[PDB]
């Protein structure tokens, strides 16, 4: 039964955990927004082989996932969970957190995302051969940018995305429930103080993040089936573990 003091302390603890593991500073992402891919560069990306484009993406995604794992390690209560629960939560949630975090690198004004040192539109990703998945992620990032998340709001929300007592395979289901509930109290308290509880009904529907992650895994299957050597040889081991079927 966490007190108001303890709840306020959880708010600060979560926000600090996030701040220390946010990968790129928001200031930098914003200052880089004028740095956009030239038409020559865009053409170059579209002319890239499918294998090279997937391999690049797998690397960047793995990098982003590593910061999420670190976020989890610093998140109050997570390391107190049993090793099996930690895995279940991260295996199901890491990519979901990355997708939420990604909205920070999305510029809604010109519909671009920060990728490989510059900003680029969705036409940059043609060579992957999953235009639907790409458009879906771009749309999702657009939906989220409209909410104008603060860094603190991202911290609290992504903590909840990770700490989900409804993930299949949890041993200490009740210990995860208790952590989830306290993080919800932390989130709702933070929102009430800043008069931002309106965003709660505007957050992604209960199966949207699940859908995007399933789509990703599926498009990887289409890729991997046709290019099985490259995945074995050059893709990050962690990436295969999380996504290869």
């Amino acid at each position: 039964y966490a007190s108001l003091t303890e709840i306020e302390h959880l708010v600060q603890s979560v926000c600090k955990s996030y701040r220390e593991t946010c990968q790129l500073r928001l200031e930098d992402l914003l200052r880089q927004r004028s740095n956009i891919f030239s038409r020559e560069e865009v053409t170059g990306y579209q002319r890239k082989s499918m294998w090279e484009m997937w391999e690049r993406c797998a690397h960047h995604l793995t990098e982003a996932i590593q910061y999420v794992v670190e976020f989890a390690k610093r998140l109050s209560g997570f390391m107190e969970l049993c090793q099996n629960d930690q895995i279940v939560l991260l295996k199901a949630g890491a990519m979901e957190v990355v997708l939420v975090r990604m909205c920070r690198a999305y510029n809604a004004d010109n519909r671009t995302v920060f990728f490989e040192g510059k900003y680029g539109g969705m036409e940059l990703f043609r060579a992957l051969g999953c235009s639907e998945l790409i458009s879906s992620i771009f749309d999702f990032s657009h939906s989220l940018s409209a909410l104008h998340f603060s860094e603190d709001e991202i911290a609290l929300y992504t903590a909840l995305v990770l700490i989900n007592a409804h993930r299949p395979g949890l041993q200490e289901k009740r210990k995860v429930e208790q952590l989830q509930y306290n993080l919800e109290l932390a989130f709702h308290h933070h929102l009430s103080k800043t008069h931002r509880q309106s965003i709660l009904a505007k957050l992604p529907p209960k199966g949207k993040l699940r859908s995007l992650c399933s789509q990703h895994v599926e498009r990887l299957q289409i890729f991997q089936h046709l290019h099985p050597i490259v995945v074995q040889a050059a893709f990050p081991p962690l990436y295969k573990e999380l996504f290869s079927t």
């Binding site: 794992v69 390690k73 090793q83 930690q86 895995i87 991260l90 962690l238 573990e241």
Partner: peptide, 8 residues
């Protein structure tokens, strides 16, 4: 799993 190793 590699997640185990990363968690330490």
């Amino acid at each position: 799993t590699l997640l185990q190793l990363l968690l330490g």
